[PDB]
Design a protein around this ligand. Structure first.
Ligand SMILES: [Ca+2]
Ligand SMILES: [Ca+2]
Ligand SMILES: [Ca+2]
Length: 235
């Protein structure tokens, strides 16, 4: 009758140190980001999520961080953020030729980390954080990715790509970052085509997943934005 915990992993151990070190490294390598004050970046990031219930985070909380992390991207070579992470697999040439969200400062900072705070202190919660499936799908991590990927989609032009997980119960899912935020922020003035690569999980070459009802739903959304749609099965 009284909630005792969140259901998800707590904040990654050493999170503050890790984010700061990543900021220092990225901004020493990238010739256009030398202006960045990594301490200010950390302060803005921490300020987004501390001293609040984790589920109460909103995109607006990340706006100070977004401002500090402003950065141009190569619009015509974007591979959007999706539930396919690792790289698909060993798509070596694709990785060479595509710009992914973790290739930006802000995506690089947060990649492969978990974080949250708590309502009653300004401390980082290392004990547990909301699980997307069990507690709340809009949490400090997922809302961070919604905020950054919104801007990323807005920047895209020409042919934009996304990799979809052909093994998911909803291959295109309106609740994912891609389905809730990115797809709706592709700009028809800039984007010619959205091409979805649907990654198969095996069973040789099974069904044509580009005919899946959820892909038809995606095709409809994109068509209504006056952008071309292309789907390919990647086996
Ligand atoms: Ca909420
Ligand atoms: Ca997805
Ligand atoms: Ca990359």
């Amino acid at each position: 009758f009284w909630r005792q915990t969140w259901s998800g992993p707590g904040t990654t151990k050493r999170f503050p140190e890790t984010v700061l070190a990543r900021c220092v490294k990225y901004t020493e390598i990238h010739p256009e980001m030398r202006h960045v004050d990594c301490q200010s970046v950390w302060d803005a990031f921490k300020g987004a999520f501390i001293s609040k219930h984790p589920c109460d985070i909103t995109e607006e909380d990340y706006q100070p961080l977004m401002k500090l992390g402003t950065q141009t991207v190569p619009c015509n070579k974007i591979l959007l953020w999706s539930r396919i992470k690792d790289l698909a697999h060993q798509f070596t040439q694709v990785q060479r030729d595509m710009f992914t969200l973790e290739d930006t400062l802000l995506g690089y900072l947060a990649d492969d980390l978990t974080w949250c705070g708590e309502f009653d202190t300004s401390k980082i919660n290392y004990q547990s954080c909301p699980d997307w499936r069990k507690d709340c799908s809009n949490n400090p991590v997922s809302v961070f990715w919604k905020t950054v990927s919104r801007r990323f989609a807005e920047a895209a032009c020409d042919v934009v790509h996304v990799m979809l997980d052909g093994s998911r119960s909803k291959i295109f899912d309106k609740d994912s970052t891609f389905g809730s935020v990115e797809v709706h922020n592709l700009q028809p003035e800039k984007v010619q085509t959205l091409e979805a690569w649907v990654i198969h999980g095996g069973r040789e070459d099974s069904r044509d997943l580009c005919q899946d009802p959820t892909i038809k739903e995606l095709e409809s959304i994109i068509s209504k934005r006056n952008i071309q749609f292309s789907c390919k099965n990647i086996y």
